[PDB]
Symmetry: C5
Subunit: 314 residues, 5 copies
């Protein structure tokens, strides 16, 4: 798609003096399309070194600079990573739209031992200082585990964060993953994903990242996602394709999520960075072709296979 | 009914420089009647998507803009919702009296697993900033689960919030639902509802939203509510009708709660928004007809059934 | 008794520019006698509606304004109530000495389920703003459950509160009720009450409200209380008479607590407010007669029965 | 012993503008000797009324004013008490060096029920305001229960407290009593006491109060204490003689703690205050004679019996 | 090795007006080499008096001034210790690069009883005040136990600390020891060590201190460490040699860790301070010779044995 500055709907918690900044950031993050292509680079904490070294993982992924190379050479809307990770590389990679992921936890403590809690790692002022030091921070990210016994803590953190972010004209993406004792088998039930989507709207987020819901007898995964996209209202819903599948199967999933599921984009992590730099760059281009330029699966697969190139300036 | 500005009892925690604002907000919230018709739109967190999509729920309710269309085209005192929900739509719906619901939780953790706790989602300054950016925020809302093992945290948050709200001349509605291990079967006992109403006054609330108490051998639900309205003193008690009954039964409950139970208004949520826009608008008009304009049940039912229209009698 | 401004002992934590305000408030609270007659109106939270409606309770008590009428038309030293309760009526009842009860809890969670904790409901600044809006706030109240597993939270709240109160020249009354798993059986042992009294001094309170200790083989309740009054040193101890006894027994209990037990006054709640307005007013006059003006039990009983009037000026 | 202002080692967290104040306070607290005689008056919270009324306790101890009379009439380095207790009496007892005990707990919850936690009762600003109102506050006290499940909370409180106190040129004494599930039988083991003393230094304390360690087969209590005094480095270690025992045995214990155990003084509570005023005052004089003036046990006992007097001049 | 000021990569969270200070501190800490020789003196809290008195520990280690004498007479990059410890001695030992260890806990509560938590002991402002009072504070240290049930608290303290330190131009060393019920036997698995190293980067640390990983069928300890050094990216990884091996084996471990494992330095505590002053000083010199001056194991061992002296080659960092 394509949008103008005037088409950006500025929420009422973005103050008058931050209005233009917010529009700048929304236009950057969505690359002037209204759609969010998110490259997720926050998994060094979440899964430790699991997604970065081992069987089936390209050796270049063992070096963190790999992520910044992909973001710089590939086509993405935003690169989402922890403040410190961005801090150590952004000087050499200034032409990326950075989304600072505000909280993180490891996966060492499993749900069965204790419900998940992912704490805000630092205040917003630390991000603002970095922005004021030349870093192109366009927004913030935060994860909520609804149904966790620690839900309250994350709700309180997330709610305050969205307010402060919009005060500064930063966009906000919430990862909402209902997880815990209470949730169990219902983790990817259609109602759970839809619930998650509605909560992000109520908190004031610009975008919400959810798991794709399971297919039911009644509906496909994408068809169930439509309910969640509706529930999120003026908050854009972004989803994920399976990390395990073929490149064409993956691109088909993303296409369905947008055109049948009503998603406003996607969030892709290990599926990109576990590949060699060349193949990873080609994948981001194929993903962005669907997400930002309305390419059908066939033409996107051509981009991935290197038969065609893709650039935003056309 | 009708009240004038001079009939508004300004409590002593509304400071001199916030007095006129408080009166403005009290008049707006009650539509110049002293009665509170509250349209509850906070349940997207509370019950996730359960109240907004599924069997018996109109397809229009799956879009959250439905709620703002109802508040704007219907007749309500206030629309109560989370800060973020209001933020995303308020610019396109400016002519609504907003009550910002300060806390929320999901219903995923049941009481049997752990006692309930609903945390304040952000500071009051976030709401004030939104107000100063042109949003018609008239007051704040907050839920307390008395008898929860987490009661103390909610008492501390609510107490401070009432003081800060009145400092700014905003009205405060407290939802008080005693819930927990300790409460159980006594959730809707007359003594419990009365206890809840009394606590809200001590915290300094302008209004308290409680469950209707169960009927006993000696007294009806509405008759038992009278004890709670009394306990609340100068804090107005608002109640709710059954979400499950027929429209006439619902409107009778509301009438009885006011005229027998001594309620100063009502809070209605899913009973409104689960209906199509037209029928939802008609229901807000029927409710407001009773609450704001003293309509008989019969005449209110005619508004619900579309036989008569309803608009506000006086504007201030 | 009778005291002058010069006889008021100003503690060292009352700052220089707050000295006169502290003296004003001490003279008001003690009605120029040094003795504290406290009318407790904080039980709408503590016991919910149990103390205000039901059998043996006058129908007028179901309306909260009843409490303010009693305080206005009766004779009291201070009326103790929550900030919010006071806020709703004080404009219509300005000529009362208000003591703002800073913390409260309900009685729904029993000790056997979990140890008690009563949280500070707001900051002191909220009380100060109400004072500066013309409410005659002479002091603050706070409850500590010593021996509770939540003891530490209340000790930290109380200690800070006393310091800030005296900084502003407000008086402080601490309710100290040892309660919890650890206490149980010993709630009203002489040593428990004496311990409670001593702690209030160490926190720096002007007055401490305790339960009366049980009688022992060796000593009467009042005799056991003498040990607690001694332990409290320059902090005045106040106590309560039995809730369910005859008015003459009750007044004899208060007299004993003062003259045998060394109490500096009393705190009475439901015994007063559960009565009809006229009888409630007479009881406050009878209590104040003993506490403030040194009446014997007979003459005070005569005041209760309406054979004699009582007022402070004369 | 005797020290001059120049001999006071000012730690580097005492800021330039607080330097002279710190020296003033160190000289006051140690009475110009470098040794700390601490009179402990904080037990009204710690053990409720148990140390102040009952069998074997003099009747005068039931009135809290007893504590201040002793502090003023006897000879002490500092009087350690809660802020509130000091607030109610200090106006009538201005010539005492006050140490404000910043945290307290009661003894109602035993270790077996739950591990101990003693919370900071108020901010430091509260003490500073009292100081600026003319109260002679020379420093602060704080208790840590290492090995408690609540250890972390007390470490965070104590660490910040030391920094702020030195910023204001106040001295800091830390009570360190390892206590909890994890400690149990090891409460007064030589390694435990030495561990405690080392932690105080790491937090930046000027002095540390510990229990004396038990005797072992190889070493006496006092001999075991030397290890702790060494571990404490430039933090002075103060100890305690056996609670309300014989005056001679008590003074002999304190003497051994200093000259064999390497202690920099003592912290005494109920052994002093549970006595009648006169005898309490004489005991403070006897304790001070050993701690401040290097008296042997025999001459300190003479002071206790009133056969000799003892003063700072 | 040797680096110049221009070769120091200044992260983007070090603000414009803190940049020169940050470089000053990075140059001081690494002695102008880019390598970190860290002398750890924080174990008086961590292990109580266990590392400082007892069998096989020199009697001089029972006096804490021992640590400052070693730091002053030996050759070290930074001396890491608690704020209080540093405060009591720093005036008499001004010519040391101090790293203030921000958190500490005792070892009294074992994992089996409760997962570990080491709390921040005071605010950063306390350290800043000391720096402005003349103490040569070059950086801060903090320990995180990943996989502990208290992981969240430490993540939050550490993240905020890194941001604040860099705002002030201070370097940051994170000790990251995954520890807890959830970790157990996996404490020193190669993947665990690599995970820990990667987290330190994400928080924004300048250096990360980890345990050496165990050897596996496939790889030696040092070969396994290479994966962790890679995961840490632009955060320098520092490791440790065994405390109970012979001096030669110890110095060989450190050498392997650098040249095979990709370490940017080392952290050594009790192996130094449990020795007599003279021997301790000689060991720091041996370690620093490998770490800062690229010595072979054999020539470093000669320094340890007192056959040769060792001093720094370059002092362009004043």
């Amino acid at each position: 798609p394509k949008i103008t500055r005037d088409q950006v709907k500025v929420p009422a918690d973005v103050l008058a003096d931050a209005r233009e900044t917010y529009i700048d950031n929304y236009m950057k993050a969505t690359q002037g399309t209204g759609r969010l292509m998110l490259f997720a680079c926050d998994q060094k904490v979440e899964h430790l070194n699991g997604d970065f070294y081992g069987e089936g993982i390209d050796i270049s992924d063992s070096d963190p600079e790999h992520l910044f190379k992909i973001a710089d050479q590939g086509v993405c809307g935003v690169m989402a990573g922890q403040r410190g990770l961005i801090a150590r590389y952004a000087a050499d990679y200034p032409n990326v739209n950075y989304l600072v992921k505000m909280n993180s936890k490891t996966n060492l403590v499993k749900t069965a031992q204790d419900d998940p809690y992912s704490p805000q790692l630092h205040d917003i002022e630390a991000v603002l200082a970095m922005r004021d030091n030349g870093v192109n921070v366009v927004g913030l990210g935060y994860t909520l585990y609804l149904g966790s016994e620690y839900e309250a803590t994350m709700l309180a953190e997330a709610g305050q964060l969205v307010a402060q972010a919009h005060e500064e004209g930063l966009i906000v993406v919430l990862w909402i993953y209902p997880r815990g004792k209470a949730v169990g088998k219902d983790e990817k039930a259609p109602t759970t994903i839809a619930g998650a989507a509605g909560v992000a709207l109520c908190l004031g987020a610009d975008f919400v990242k959810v798991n794709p819901p399971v297919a039911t007898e009644d509906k496909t995964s994408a068809e169930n996602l439509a309910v969640a996209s509706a529930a999120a209202g003026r908050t854009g819903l972004v989803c994920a394709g399976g990390s395990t599948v073929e490149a064409k199967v993956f691109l088909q999933q993303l296409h369905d999520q947008i055109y049948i599921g009503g998603a406003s984009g996607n969030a892709t992590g290990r599926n990109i960075h576990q590949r060699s730099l060349d193949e990873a760059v080609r994948l981001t281009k194929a993903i962005s072709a669907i997400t930002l330029a309305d390419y059908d699966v066939d033409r996107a697969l051509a981009v991935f296979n290197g038969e065609e190139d893709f650039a935003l300036h056309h």
